[PDB]
Amino acid sequence: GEYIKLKVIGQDSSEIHFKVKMTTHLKKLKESYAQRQGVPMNSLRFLFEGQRIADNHTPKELGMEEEDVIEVYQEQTGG
Amino acid sequence: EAEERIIVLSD
């Protein structure tokens, strides 16, 4: 086990998929996605099973598997 | 309509 594909679901139901190592910090995925949407990374919250993905979280830590989904929500007002 | 998008992230 090395790489898995994660599906990132955009706010408009578009998707971008990322191949990541099980030990890669998910900051890299968050930054890439935000860059590709042209929005500041801190305007977004990235959720796995409804829980907030921190910059330092890894797929291994969060228990992610092949084709698991990450949802992108706008940050909450004041968050 | 959108094409498939797969990005490999460096470690």
For residue A29, the chain B residue with the least C-alpha distance is: B9
Closest Cα in chain A to B1: A14
**Interchain contact A29–B (C-beta under 8 A):** yes
Q: Residue A16 has which token pair?
A: 């971008």
For A14, A22, A34, A51, B11, the CA distances from A46, given in Å and listed in that order, are 15, 17, 10, 8, 20
Q: What is the 3-state secondary structure (H, E, C) of A9-53?
A: ECCCCCEEEEEEECCCCCHHHHHHHHHHHCCCHHHEEEEECCEEC
**At how many Å resolution was this determined?**
1.6
Q: What is the number of structural domains in chain A?
A: 1
Structural domain containing residue A47:
1-79
Chain B contact for A20 (CB, 8 A cutoff): yes
- Tell how far CA B11 is from the center of its chain: 16
